[PDB]
Structures are given as C-alpha cells and as structure tokens.
C-alpha cells in the first residue's frame, strides 16, 4: 500500500536551524485523531486552535492540519496489524511539531504501549507536564490554587525500557541463572516462577533531561528545580539520577552549595534570580505535593516516578481530564491528550476536550505563537469560571450549565 | 562481646502453635527505641500501652518489655559497625512479637536500609498499613473521612531486593554485555555510564501476600480487595502480580467472574458477604484515592507501589505522623513507627507519638488483646477531638491546646 496521508496543498513545513524552530505563517501540522473519545475531542481542538490563531494574528497565520495515523484508525486505514505505521514516525520527524488524541494498545498480541513506542522511536526524551489550577475547577483538595508545577519526566529509560522476561520462560531462567551463578546474586527471594525486569538509568539520559529542566526554569524564571527519586533504596539508578542531576547543575550552570548542602543555588543569567536545585525522596514527595505544594515548582524525575507524580498532581487540582502534555526531543515534539480513550462515551460529544486543547496551547507556545496560546488559556479560564462546562465538571458543582464537548470548545472561543 | 540484652525475670515468651499465637498473661515484648525522635516517642508508647493493658484487664495481664537494639544506639551498645546485631534478628523471631521506633541508615558505608534488612532477614513479607481518618485531624483534603483502607504491601521482592550495579563498574558492564550480547537486548537507550537494577516478582511471593490480604478481608468483613499494579508497562512483574492475584482468588477462595470481567466476587464464608476482587493501574489509583476514596478498601500491591500508596494515603488524611504499620511474617511480626527520625527535634519531647502508639494498637490486636487495643483507639480519638495535641497538629488548627510528646501520651490515657 501507498501512503494514505494527504500533504496540504497550501502549507509549508516547519524547519529546524540551530536547535531553533523556523515556523512559517502557514505551517503544516500533523495530527492523530486518537482512539475512542479522540473522535470527540480532536475536532473541538482543531476548531479552538484555528479560532485562537485567527484571532491573534488577524488572518496572517493559519495552520494546515494534516491527518496522520496510529491506533485502531490506523488499522482501518492501513489494514490488519498496522497499529503504528513507519510513515507516522517519518512524518512527525519531518514536520517537527505534531499533536495526538488518546491512544490505547491492543491486549493479547504481545504489543507494547503505542504511546511509549512513539516516545522511544522518536527519542522524545522529555515528557513535559505542567500542572496548574484553573479557578472554578471542582477539586478534592482545600487549596488547589497553591499548585503550580512543571514536571520534566525522563521518557527514554527506566523500567519503561520494556526489558523483561515472563515467569518460567526459558529466557527468564537463563537470566536468573546468569544472575545467581555469574553475578553471585543471592537476593532473589523466590527464583522459581519468577518474572524479571531490568531498570536502566544512564548519565547521558539523566543529564539531557535535567539540562532541559534547568534551561526551562531559567527561560521562565521559575524558583526551583526539585530532583525527585527513590535513591535510598535504588542507589545506582534513582540515586545516580539525583547525583548526576546535581552534578550537571554544578558543571553546566554554576550551581553552588547552599549553606551546608545538599541544595545548590543556580543564578538565572537573565534575571539574576537564584534558582534553588534540591531533591526529595519520591514517597515523601507524594505527601509534600499535598501538604506544601507552594514549595515546589519545576520537577525533574525518572520515567516511572514522573508517570505517578503527573497523575497525582492532575487529580489534586481537579484536572484529571484537562491536563496538558508534550513529548519533546531534539528534532521533533508530539503534543498529546493525557487521559485515556473512554470508549464508553466515544462519539457522544460528551467528554472534556480540555486536555487536548491545553496540549495544543503548549504546542502553539512551542511554535513561538504565544499570543494564540495566551488566547486559549484565557478562553479556558473564562469558560470554567463561567461554570459553562462538560459533565465531568458539572456533576461536581452546583449552578453549572452543562455543555457538550463541542459546545465547551465554543465556550472557550467565546471567552477569548 | 556477650549479649547486652536483659531477659525480664517475670515474663513469659509468646509461642506459636498451628499458625496461632499463644499469648501468656505476662508476655515478654522486645522493643527497639529507634534513632532520633525514637527517644521521645518510645517512652510515650510504653506508658500508653501499659495503661491500656492495665485498664482493660484489671491487672490480670502485663507486658514485660525487653529492650533490644538496632541503629545508632546499637553501635553505642555493641560497638563500631554493629548497626543490626544478629541477636536482634534471633530475639524477634524467638519472642514472636516486637515493636520499634524509627530507624535511619548511615550513608557512605555501602549499607542498605536497616528497615528493609529487618523485613527481609526475618521474611516479614506483609507490610500492613491501615489508613483511616481520625475526626478532628487537620487534613489537606475536603473529605478525609471517606478514606478507610488497609494496604497489604509485598515486602520481600520487587526492586527493593537491592540487586543493582553502579554505572561504569565492571559488574554493570558485565551485566549489560550479557543482556545485549546473550539476551539480545536492544532497548537500553544509553548502554554506557549506565546503572542497572533488577526487579523480581514471583508466583509464590505474590500469592502469599494476596492470600493474606483476602484472609484479612474475610476476617474483618471488608468489601473488596484491589490489586494495584502497573502491568500495562511491566507485563511480567507487575502484570504477573495482578494475574496471579486473581488466579489465587479463583483457586483458593472460589472467586468467580462478575458480569463480563475482569472483577471477581469472593463469598465471605463467615458472613455470606460478596467480597469484590478488582484491580486498578497504579498511576490511576493515585488519582482514585483522592477522587473516589469510598470505593476502595483492602489493597494488595507490590513493594514499591505500596511504599508510595501508603505515604500518599497517610498524607491525605492528615496522618503523615500518626500512621501505624506492621511487618508480618509466618513466624514473627515487627510493629513500627512509620515516620522518619526527625533528628532536629530529637530529645525535645516535641513530636507526635501517635504513629508508634497506633502501631502498638495493631500489635495488641495481633496478640488478641483487642480490648486494650480498642482503648488506645478510643484514647487517640478523644485526645484529637479534644484538640489537645502536639505541634504538628496544633500549628494547623485554631483553638488547640499545644502539648508536649509525653503530654499527648497522657491525653490519650486520659481519654480511654
């Protein structure tokens, strides 16, 4: 089969020169509709983004959307077993900036996460999850407004590497024999009927992630960067991530000891502000985000902890369904809805398009189209304050006006 | 050196016959004071427990406390480098039931967690963390009273096995060569300057833990058992834990499919109640405990996830410093304060003795001395409701009367 992707006639490709995106006034942006509710949320995002772009630049700029495929729809387009076509990886890399709805992975075929596959195959090593509170959002906590954090989750290593062998398989036995006989491992409690997973953490992987977090703190004049890890138990992976993170702050950003340690102060070269570089053990950190959220800002952590932290924070601010996210690498970036596919409601024009819309806000900002991005934030803040919202919010409040998915997109536009 | 432990003259050893403890009226109970604030909280616990015992059984029963050592104090007693004496492991096993204050592990000597060492060496495979709300406790969430859960955290395997090699070490390189050359591993993003950790999960380890969780749900007529795991990424360890947990429910407890699955219903043989056996992915679970806490009850999970879940739950109910905990095995059990050593306040009679006191409540209950246990719960509930509390609580409320650590122990007794 030939490609089924149609490159927009009007429209120009974004280019990269010196780690800086050169964005034309008519950029072609690939988008993946997404499985399940992607069918509801993606069109709402397309309309909201076009309106923000149109309103901000008065018609001088316009995105040429180009549909590309991954997931169930990809099998419908490309046939049986084509869940993630090579052309999709090629196109995201070529066009530099893309966005996607939610995706789920089939079970029973030995296929691993399609979301993780996109991240790893494109080497999008930064999973960026900013978490703030939108006034008027129903929240399970007393002071959600105190939460304003940005999570830099390492996206290329950790136990997500997907290196593991099934209990009783010849391979697991082979690995366990090697560990026990050649490495002298004596700590496996039950070596029989035992599954084995491998957790890698490297200096290069850690430093490119932490480097991005510190550059982000500098560029946005944030107050601190917290390295979250479980290094007191996993000394050589989690503990190494922490050590390498502080080392990078010292070696590349002039970080110097605060008092007697272990925190460092990094001077913002643009504002002269002192950015604090500190660290917190992961289990205590899940308590601290609830008890002292105001003391945290930019967070840098490994893949698994980042997954947990991002989710816990989204829930606490009432944003489980409106949490934006990006996967960024040195050559391209893929923005994404961060919730699941919710098939029970798919096609009903019911769910909250807020997450994919705020991920589109991050995309526009990444493109340097900050005015259009600010209009989306403004629209989202006003629609939620107006209490004109989708069921997931409405059901938790009194005095709200219930809107369909598409209608909430319109409300966002109405509030720009 | 000879033992420095003094076996109580009056006092008899608890015995085990058929997996059932035979507790005399004068049981000898070993206790470890603990590092840091253990010096403040342990004496408060001893006094509170003695009072509950005295009040419940009118003098017919009395614990003969026997001090044993681990941590900084152990080095003071047994000399340089004796952080965890063999005799301590021997004594906890011999006397069957013991309690300890907090312990921290020295850094710089390549020593691994002393708390984990106690758990693994004594094969205390169940880390039991019940989490409920005490009326009047200052909490960061709007409805902490909806939380009433019991966590069964697997304590003998997972990445806590402590099997890992340092970046650039000959061993790490050896392991990575084996993986890449012999196992054909291609998923390690950066094989150089790479730390490696091993995560084991076995059928026997999983099932003894889940078996205990289900027996606990039956014995206490709880509503459900939720298997929490991250099996969609770690198929052979986390996913296997989930699969084995449902399998055990079917094989040993008659669990049968609910509707179209995947949940099972297990009939309580004593009350005829239908216990639901279900599962939730770990990242979503950290959101669900905040958004729908009332839907969860008994939780069964692996070592790392349990560590995180226990901490997150304790924080949400305002119980970061009063969370009880037990480590239970087939031959003995070790109850423990669950917070850290807080050396900055050690010796000031300032901190909350609530966690070690509620762990003593679990110990008394475990001993079958449920009346004395109920008196501690009653005392704790009344002292907190009276707003007569330690600084960690007082500072978060208005109208409280500030009490010292020792004074709060007295307030607990005053409210029995």
UniProtKB/Swiss-Prot annotation, chains A, B:
The modification Phosphoserine is found at residue 113. The keyword Transferase does not apply. The modification N6-acetyllysine is found at residue 142. The record marks 160, 230 as: Critical for catalysis. Keywords: Acetylation, Glyoxylate bypass, Magnesium, Manganese, Metal-binding, NADP, Oxidoreductase, Phosphoprotein, Tricarboxylic acid cycle. Gene3D superfamilies: Isopropylmalate Dehydrogenase (3.40.718.10). PROSITE patterns: IDH_IMDH. Phosphorylation state of this enzyme is controlled by isocitrate dehydrogenase kinase/phosphatase (AceK). One of its GO terms (molecular function) is NAD binding. Transmembrane segments: none annotated. Mn(2+) binds at residues 307, 311. D-threo-isocitrate binds at residues 113, 115, 119, 129, 153. One of its GO terms (biological process) is response to oxidative stress. SUPFAM superfamilies: Isocitrate/Isopropylmalate dehydrogenase-like. It comes from the Bacteria. Its cofactor is Mg(2+); Mn(2+). Inhibition of this enzyme by phosphorylation regulates the branch point between the Krebs cycle and the glyoxylate bypass, which is an alternate route that accumulates carbon for biosynthesis when acetate is the sole carbon source for growth. Catalyzes the oxidative decarboxylation of isocitrate to 2-oxoglutarate and carbon dioxide with the concomitant reduction of NADP(+). Homodimer. This is Isocitrate dehydrogenase [NADP]. It comes from Escherichia coli (strain K12). The lineage of its organism: Bacteria, Pseudomonadati, Pseudomonadota, Gammaproteobacteria, Enterobacterales.
């Amino acid at each position: 089969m030939e490609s089924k992707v149609v490159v927009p006639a009007q429209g120009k490709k974004i280019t990269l020169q010196n780690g800086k995106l050169n964005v034309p006034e008519n950029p072609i942006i690939p988008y993946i509709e997404g499985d399940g509710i992607g069918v509801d949320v993606t069109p709402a995002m397309l309309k909201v983004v076009d309106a923000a772009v149109e309103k901000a630049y008065k018609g001088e700029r316009k995105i040429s959307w180009m549909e590309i495929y991954t997931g169930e729809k990809s099998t419908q387009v490309y046939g049986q077993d084509v869940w993630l076509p090579a052309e999709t990886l090629d196109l995201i890399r070529e066009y530099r900036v893309a966005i996607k709805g939610p995706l789920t992975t089939p079970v029973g075929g030995g296929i691993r996460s399609l979301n993780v596959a996109l991240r790893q195959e494109l080497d999008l090593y930064i999973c960026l999850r900013p978490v703030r509170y939108y006034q008027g959002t129903p929240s399970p906590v007393k002071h959600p407004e105190l939460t304003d954090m940005v999570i830099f989750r390492e996206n290329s290593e950790d136990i997500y590497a997907g290196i593991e062998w099934k209990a009783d398989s010849a391979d697991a036995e082979k690995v366990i024999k090697f560990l026990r006989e050649e490495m002298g491992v004596k700590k496996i409690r039950f070596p029989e009927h035992c599954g084995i997973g491998i957790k890698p953490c490297s200096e290069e992987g850690t430093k490119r992630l932490v480097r991005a977090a510190i550059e982000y703190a500098i560029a946005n004049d944030r107050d601190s960067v917290t390295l979250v890890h479980k290094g007191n138990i996993m000394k050589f992976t989690e503990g190494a991530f922490k050590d390498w993170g502080y080392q990078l702050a010292r070696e590349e950003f002039g970080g110097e000891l605060i008092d007697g340690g272990p925190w460092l102060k990094v001077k913002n070269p643009n504002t002269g502000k002192e950015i604090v570089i500190k660290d917190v053990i992961a289990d205590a950190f899940l308590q601290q985000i609830l008890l002292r959220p105001a003391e945290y800002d930019v967070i840098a952590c490994m893949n698994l902890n980042g997954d947990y932290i991002s989710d816990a924070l989204a829930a606490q601010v009432g944003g489980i369904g409106i949490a934006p996210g990006a996967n960024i690498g040195d050559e391209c970036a893929l923005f994404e809805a961060t919730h699941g596919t919710a098939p029970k409601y798919a096609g009903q024009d019911k769910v909250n398009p807020g997450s994919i819309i705020l991920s589109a806000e991050m995309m526009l900002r990444h493109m340097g189209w900050t005015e259009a991005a600010d209009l989306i934030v403004k629209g989202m803040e006003g629609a939620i304050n107006a209490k004109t919202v989708t069921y997931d919010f409405e059901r938790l409040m009194d005095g709200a006006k219930l809107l369909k998915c598409s209608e909430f997109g319109d409300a966002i536009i109405e509030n720009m």
